[PDB]
Design a protein that fits this description.
With about 325 residues, the protein is an all-alpha fold. The protein has one domain: Orthogonal Bundle (Catalytic domain of cyclic nucleotide phosphodiesterase 4b2b), CATH 1.10.1300.10. The chain contains 14 helices and no strands. Bound molecules: the ligand COc1ccc(-n2c(CCN3C(=O)c4ccccc4C3=O)nc3ccccc3c2=O)cc1, magnesium ion and zinc ion. Belongs to the cyclic nucleotide phosphodiesterase family.
């Protein structure tokens, strides 16, 4: 009960910042995650023994893929921690519990392949889940781990609170399907501008939590340039592998997944910042002003990509 996690001074201070990188020491990531739960949620939110056993079973069920790996899970959960800590009073007790867990679990058992590759391959999961294929799988894996003996971290919630938290987590994980982001942000844009946005409207909270999950999931674009630049290598390492697998199915992949078109990456990054990232953090900043540093860091990285195209790096 009186057992706190404590980080070295540099990490204690930098973990509070949006652009924090969790570093290359894998054995510290569980401790970083528990530290964020204790500060974000309370030292009483979860039984430590159960949380530790939940964390290590989640870790075990992430795969050795270049990008959609255990490091991504913890990185995305840190961004959520930064949003929640900078917006103290806006989120319920259940929501703080649910969203950090949702982030840790959001890409469980990812194979490094998009929903589109699963469908073109005719993967069994494409028959089981026709839309948001991988995201329904990620939620399924989350419930499976919660039902392992000794792993139910929500045990001391009431029947109704338990149903509420799994519903928060399900919506949160489904919302990480980027195909669903565009419509969710368009609706949030209209609600914010016509002034109809109402954080007591549950359907509105869902939309706002959905956008938070997009923002955390894309947070690679909100780090300092050297982290962003090096993470891009891992992202494209997966896309190019999917591209190769498209070619094996006798389908020319989109340039984004075609390793023969590396030259086109700098311009594709501009398109992605302009079409996805900047709009995402802009709308998020309007709804939640204290998330402005995500938008500023994103704009900084857009400028860095424009310098790459101008041969300046
Ligand atoms: C829909 O708007 C888009 C979509 C894709 C693109 N796009 C991209 C963006 C790549 N990208 C994701 O998709 C993504 C998802 C999640 C995290 C990080 C990322 C991330 O870095 N790269 C290219 C590279 C070369 C050639 C072409 C393209 C191309 O068209 C541009 C605009
Ligand atoms: Mg995902
Ligand atoms: Zn993800």
């Amino acid at each position: 009960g009186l057992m706190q996690f404590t980080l070295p001074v540099r990490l204690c201070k930098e973990i509070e910042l949006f652009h924090f990188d969790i570093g290359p020491f894998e054995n510290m990531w569980p401790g970083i995650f528990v530290y964020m739960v204790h500060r974000s949620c309370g030292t009483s939110c979860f039984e430590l023994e159960k949380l530790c056993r939940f964390i290590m079973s989640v870790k075990k069920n992430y795969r050795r893929v270049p990008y959609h790996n255990w490091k991504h899970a913890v990185t995305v959960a840190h961004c959520m921690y930064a949003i929640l800590q900078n917006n103290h009073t806006l989120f319920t007790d259940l929501e703080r519990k649910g969203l950090l867990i949702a982030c840790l679990c959001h890409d469980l058992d990812h194979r490094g392949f998009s929903n589109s590759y699963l469908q073109k391959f005719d993967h069994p999961l494409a028959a089981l889940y026709s839309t948001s294929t991988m995201e329904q799988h990620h939620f399924s894996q989350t419930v499976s781990i919660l039902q392992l003996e000794g792993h139910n971290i929500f045990s001391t919630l009431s029947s109704s609170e338990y149903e509420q938290v799994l519903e928060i987590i399900r919506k949160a994980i489904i919302a990480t399907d980027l195909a669903l982001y565009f419509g969710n942000r368009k609706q949030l844009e209209e609600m914010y501008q016509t002034g109809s946005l109402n954080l007591n409207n549950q359907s509105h909270r869902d939309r706002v939590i959905g956008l938070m999950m997009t923002a955390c999931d894309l947070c690679s674009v909100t780090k300092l340039w050297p982290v962003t630049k090096l993470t891009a290598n891992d992202i494209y390492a997966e896309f190019w592998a999917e591209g190769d697998e498209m070619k094996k199915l006798g389908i020319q992949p989109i340039p984004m997944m075609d390793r023969d078109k590396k030259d086109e990456v700098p311009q594709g990054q501009l398109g992605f910042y302009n079409a996805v990232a900047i709009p995402c953090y802009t709308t998020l900043t309007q709804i939640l002003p204290p998330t402005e540093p995500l938008l500023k860091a994103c704009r900084d990285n857009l400028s860095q990509w424009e310098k790459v195209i101008r041969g300046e790096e």
